Amino acid sequence: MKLYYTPGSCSLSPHIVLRETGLDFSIERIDLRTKKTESGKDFLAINPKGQVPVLQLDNGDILTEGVAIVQYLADLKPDRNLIAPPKALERYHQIEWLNFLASEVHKGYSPLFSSDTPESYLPVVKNKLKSKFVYINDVLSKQKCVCGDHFTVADAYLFTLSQWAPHVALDLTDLSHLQDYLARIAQRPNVHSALVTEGLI
Amino acid sequence: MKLYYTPGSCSLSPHIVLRETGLDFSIERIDLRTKKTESGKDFLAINPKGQVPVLQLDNGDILTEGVAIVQYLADLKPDRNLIAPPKALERYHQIEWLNFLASEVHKGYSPLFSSDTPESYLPVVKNKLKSKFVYINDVLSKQKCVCGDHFTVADAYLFTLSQWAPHVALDLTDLSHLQDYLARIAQRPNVHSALVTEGLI
Ligand SMILES: *SC[C@H](NC(=O)CC[C@H](N)C(=O)O)C(=O)NCC(=O)O
Ligand SMILES: *SC[C@H](NC(=O)CC[C@H](N)C(=O)O)C(=O)NCC(=O)O
């Protein structure tokens, strides 16, 4: 399969996941300003929504939306346990966390990246985002990973989303349980490996 | 089980779904301004995130996040086909749509409901939201429901989210394929039934 991505963006999540699954995949950069693939092709014809990540399956089908992507993957290599079996309870709490990250944290960043966002509304947005991380912090002071004890697709997404913190001037240094957790993920082989391949580290 | 909700909010989605599943459930209103249940209990102790919907399962476990909720439900009564089996492809496109609705449409409304949102940033936000509906419109001019031919948990969520349009002054009247689709859902028994129980219709 082929994962379309942009270095440092949210596609980093499924990237980290692709490695942990130890699968066969090809990646291809996307230029978000021109909406063109590094090979010079029209990206809107691949994904009308014009964002990354996007995943091309071996049968030509396209899967958009990070949370959908990381789940399709993790659900192919159960043995690695990046998820929980479907219909199971643990899984439902995982989907719940993925939705929270996608809608409350991920989308909470959006305005800090827009040029048309009133510089005055910026401190307000930041505070909203911080509170979200303060909560995640709490969750961590009791368990290893956000969705339990073992590393899951939801930890990849949270890691990716916290990488943007610096670039937007969001100090999460105080969140000790989060930091130690972040530090513990930056060490994982395939995380460090996927990070290098992207031009960071 | 007990579904915590607020009339007209996003909890309307899992409400509509609870009926379609023809299950045994009890509902309880939540006062969002005081963060108290209609019985006068502290809602933050039920859901630290302080929002609806929230679902209490028969074993006392709490499931937050709409998309997680509507999936746990639909996955209990397969025969009705409100989803697709797990691991299946159709399902993955469903989770993808649920994420889109949750993060791009649902969260796209958020600012139009905040008081601290600069009245000037408002037309900008509206336009962002409209474009999302314009896309959904396109998708509809080819298929019956958003995720295929049959009615799914994702249609309940989209219906609920379009109900807010008027209250924020968002004209989606031009979107003919969407409207006819909306009109066709407002007719469904359990939709109309769940809508009445909530004080609308
Ligand atoms: S993180 C980079 C941007 N992607 C998304 O916002 C994905 C949103 C989906 N709802 C999801 O995958 O969860 C992106 O590519 N933005 C495009 C741009 O032009 O900035
Ligand atoms: S729609 C009403 C509000 N709920 C949510 O925003 C749910 C967000 C979750 N990410 C989800 O379920 O998808 C709500 O209850 N807001 C609380 C308030 O005080 O307004």
Swiss-Prot record, chains A, B:
Protein name (database record): Glutathione S-transferase GST-6.0
Residue ranges of domain GST N-terminal in the record: 1-81
Keyword Lipid metabolism attached: no
Subunit structure: Homodimer.
GO cellular component terms, A-Z: cytoplasm
Native species: Proteus mirabilis
Family label: Belongs to the GST superfamily. Beta family.
Keywords, in A-Z order: Cytoplasm, Transferase
Residues the record lists as binding glutathione: C10, K35, V52, E65, G66, N99, S103, E104, V105, H106, K107
